Amino acid sequence: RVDPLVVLFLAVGFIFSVVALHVISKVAGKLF
Amino acid sequence: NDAHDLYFQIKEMSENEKIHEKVLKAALLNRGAESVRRSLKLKELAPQINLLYKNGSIGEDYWKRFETEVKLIELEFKDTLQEAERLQPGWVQLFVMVCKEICFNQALSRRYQSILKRKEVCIKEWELKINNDGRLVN
């Protein structure tokens, strides 16, 4: 029992999580 | 807008105020009659509501609310019949018949009572001038 907006929220949240992992990797590499 | 809680109010008043024992049966018959009228109304109104829902002009949650009311009415009727069986021994085979009659009968009585008021809305609407004896004075 899932609504469409739930699927869209999951997809955008996952894209956000991947880009966030990339950016935290970059800032950790540049900082130290 | 219901005749349910009125019987419970009469019962809580009976618990203290020493009301006569037939008034309980009276309120019970009235509640049964209202439940029967409602059941008939819903059984007859199901198809048109369903058609309006399929055509898409009533929304979505109203149909679920309707389907809930259909069974809530049945459970209320069953509870009332059980209370009736409790009130008098071997008194359920006669109860449904007495109820199915009083429903229609009091519906007719109310419809016939309504004309004493309905007689004046026509006068106000058509601006008639009727003197005594109901005649027309133009």
Partner: protein, 190 residues
């Protein structure tokens, strides 16, 4: 709230302003209680009562006998009293198919009498109830059209005459009423 009378065994609402549904329900419960008090058998039967029917018929016959005496004023009062009795003192758990036709057979006579006497609004309203409770015949539509014409309502007169002629097209009086309505309305406009 609501206070229970002691001696009269009637439930009475003691609040100042009560809604309409509660008033109708309290009236119904008063009637049911006062009737159960009179009915002494513990297990009542939907079988109708006999003394009430005999007295109703007696009053109705005493009212109808004024037709032979050419008394057209008190016969209406007697028939009204008989209908009021058959409406009030008949316990609601008595059968439906025996309480409906008696009411109709008395109400039709009252309608004929009132329409002959001269009162028109009461006759039209009685006809509307009689036709709304499930009785559709050319013995009702002709008089309803007569009333709607006599108290000056033309469009609904035409609508009712047409509905009547669309159920008994071979009738002989509905066409006269339709022609009269058409003429009077063509005057009403032009």
């Amino acid at each position: 709230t609501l206070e229970y009378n002691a001696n009269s065994k009637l439930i009475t609402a003691s609040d100042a302003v009560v809604a309409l549904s509660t008033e109708t329900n309290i009236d119904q419960i008063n009637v049911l209680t006062t009737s159960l008090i009179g009915e002494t058998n513990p297990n009542f039967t939907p079988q109708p009562n006999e003394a009430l029917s005999k007295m109703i018929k007696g009053l109705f016959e005493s009212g109808m006998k004024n037709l032979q005496q050419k008394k057209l004023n008190e016969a209406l009062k007697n028939v009204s009293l008989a209908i009021e009795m058959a409406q009030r003192k008949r316990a609601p758990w008595e059968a439906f198919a025996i309480q409906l036709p008696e009411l109709h057979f008395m109400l039709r006579s009252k309608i004929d009498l009132c329409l002959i006497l001269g009162k028109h609004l009461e006759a039209l309203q009685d006809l509307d109830f009689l036709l709304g409770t499930g009785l559709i015949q050319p013995d009702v539509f002709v008089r309803k059209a007569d009333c709607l014409l006599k108290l000056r309502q033309w469009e609904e007169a035409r609508a009712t005459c047409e509905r009547g002629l669309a159920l008994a097209p071979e009738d002989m009086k509905l066409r006269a009423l339709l022609i009269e309505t058409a003429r009077n309305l063509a005057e009403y406009n032009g």
